[PDB]
Every structure is written in structure tokens, then in C-alpha cells.
Amino acid sequence: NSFSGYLKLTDNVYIKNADIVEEAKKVKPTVVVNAANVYLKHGGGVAGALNKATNNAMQVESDDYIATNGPLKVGGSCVLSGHNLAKHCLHVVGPNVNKGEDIQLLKSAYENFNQHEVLLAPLLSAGIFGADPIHSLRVCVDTVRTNVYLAVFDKNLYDKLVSSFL
Numbered sequence: 001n002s003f004s005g006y007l008k009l010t011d012n013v014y015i016k017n018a019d020i021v022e023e024a025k026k027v028k029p030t031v032v033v034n035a036a037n038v039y040l041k042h043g044g045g046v047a048g049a050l051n052k053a054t055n056n057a058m059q060v061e062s063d064d065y066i067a068t069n070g071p072l073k074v075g076g077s078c079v080l081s082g083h084n085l086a087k088h089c090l091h092v093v094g095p096n097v098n099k100g101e102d103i104q105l106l107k108s109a110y111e112n113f114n115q116h117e118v119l120l121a122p123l124l125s126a127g128i129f130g131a132d133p134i135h136s137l138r139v140c141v142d143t144v145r146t147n148v149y150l151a152v153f154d155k156n157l158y159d160k161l162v163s164s165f166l
């Protein structure tokens with residue numbers, strides 16, 4: 001299957017009201033982005049959901065990556081297997097502003113997307129990380145230069161995001 005049902009916000013950013021787990025299972029994109037933490041512990045939010053959809057194969061692989069390479073930096077990323085969701089998973093660490101991490105690092109986090117021509121992604125630093133989701137979409141639009149398909153689960157949030165752009 002291919003991406004379908006997205007609204008084009010800019011020349012390279014698309015958005016859909018969808019559960020990113022269901023989009024990944026259907027489309028099996030070349031790259032799905034995980035909203036990760038520095039130790040790749042996929043406990044809640046989108047990370048917990050993507051890891052559960054791989055039946056914990058993502059966490060076992062992530063633990064081996066950490067033991068061999070050490071933790072990521074905030075604003076950094078690594079490429080691991082996408083398992084059943086994608087060819088690759090790009091694990092990207094946005095700042096956790098609820099813990100005093102600098103919001104400037106949200107631009108650095110999205111810059112990691114530019115190494116891939118097409119990605120399926122969530123909004124970074126939204127949810128448990130505490131950033132305003134409409135600010136996260138603005139940083140995405142201002143920073144990502146490649147084609148990004150953003151999936152937003154919550155209908156109320158999706159409608160707010162689309163209204164801020166159109």
C-alpha cells in the first residue's frame with residue numbers, strides 16, 4: 001500500500017488524522033520515525049505504541065544498540081530496523097521541556113529527518129515531552145527539507161493544527 005488521505009500543508013509536509021501504528025502497518029514505509037528518549041526505553045506515548053506493535057522486538061534491539069554504542073544525545077538520532085512497521089526506524093530524541101531541556105534542540109531533532117527523502121513521523125516533543133504541538137509543527141515546517149508524512153491521532157489536535165496552517 002502507498003500513503004493516502006494526507007492533506008498537503010507545504011511543498012514537502014503532509015498531515016493526516018491517523019494512528020501512526022496503523023499507518024505504518026498498512027504502508028510499510030521506507031522510514032518510520034520514533035519519538036525516542038536517549039536510552040531508547042520505549043515506555044509510553046508513540047514510542048510505547050510502536051514498540052508494542054513489534055511485540056517488543058524493537059526494545060530488545062534498542063537495548064543491544066545502547067549496550068554497544070551508549071545513549072543518544074538530545075537532538076540526535078540512530079537508524080535501527082523497522083521490523084514489521086517499516087524498512088527502517090529512525091529513533092529521534094526531541095527535548096523534554098518538562099525536564100528543563102532546551103527547546104532550541106527541537107530544530108536539531110528535526111534536522112535528522114533530512115538524511116531520508118520520505119518519512120512517516122509523529123510530532124516531536126509533543127505529549128510526555130511537553131512542547132506545544134503547534135510550535136512543534138512550525139519547527140518541522142521551517143526545518144525539514146525532505147518529504148514528511150505526519151500522522152496525528154487525536155482529532156481535536158489535528159483540527160487545531162490544520163486551522164493554524166490554512
Ligand SMILES: Nc1nc2ccc(C3=C(C(=O)O)CCC3)cc2s1
Nearest residue numbers: 019020045046049126127152153154
Ligand atoms: N497508537 C498510538 N499511540 C499514541 C500515543 C500518543 C500519541 C500522541 C499524539 C497524537 O498524535 O495524538 C500527540 C501526543 C502523543 C499518538 C499515538 S498513536
